[PDB]
């Protein structure tokens, strides 16, 4: 097989993703969505983790759900789905403590803050999490590549 859904990955591990994987899926998915916007592809909200496809080479793409849409709404729905992958298997009354830069990323993506407006803004914030910003493409590809290979061993 060449791709696993984020949903499959969560089920196989029966535990949430780690923080680095959240940063990486976010960066990588936004990279693909940005390439698709260049070709005026139809925009789809991320309804569940099933739509997020992690590939053997570490690319991450967004499939349409089996069933107008602003760029910000795709981002918002991705932010929500990523948060649920970090929260996977927790009781409704418990809450994972995220590092502050990652909480901030999610808060801004989901518009729950008490300012991100494109795929490119999300990528900039993900790149800034690394000590050396220019390592982002190779590092985040490597994280998702490892996430795939490891899940395939189980």
């Amino acid at each position: 097989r060449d791709a696993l859904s984020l949903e499959e990955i969560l089920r196989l591990y029966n535990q949430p993703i780690n923080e680095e994987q959240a940063w990486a899926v976010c960066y990588q998915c936004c990279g693909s969505l940005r390439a698709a916007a260049r070709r005026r592809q139809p925009r789809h909200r991320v309804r569940s983790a099933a739509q997020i496809r992690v590939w053997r080479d570490g690319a991450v793409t967004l499939a349409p759900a089996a069933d107008q849409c602003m760029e910000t709404e795709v981002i918002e729905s991705l932010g929500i789905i990523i948060y649920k992958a970090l929260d996977y298997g927790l009781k409704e009354n418990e809450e994972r403590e995220l590092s502050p830069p990652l909480e901030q990323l999610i808060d801004h993506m989901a518009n729950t803050v008490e300012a991100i407006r494109s795929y490119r803004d999300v990528m900039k914030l993900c790149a800034a999490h690394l000590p050396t910003e220019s390592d982002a493409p190779n590092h985040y590809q490597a994280v998702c590549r490892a996430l795939f290979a490891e899940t395939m061993e189980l």
Binding site: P16, N18, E19, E76, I80, Y83, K84, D87, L90, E92, N93, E94, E95, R96, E97, L98, E103, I106, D107, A110, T112, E114
Partner: peptide, 19 residues
């Protein structure tokens, strides 16, 4: 990772209200 009791109007709570 650290687990703590759900925070009133923290991130988990704000996100539960969007869905």
């Amino acid at each position: 990772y650290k687990i703590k009791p759900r925070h009133d109007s923290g991130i988990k709570a704000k996100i539960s209200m969007k869905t």
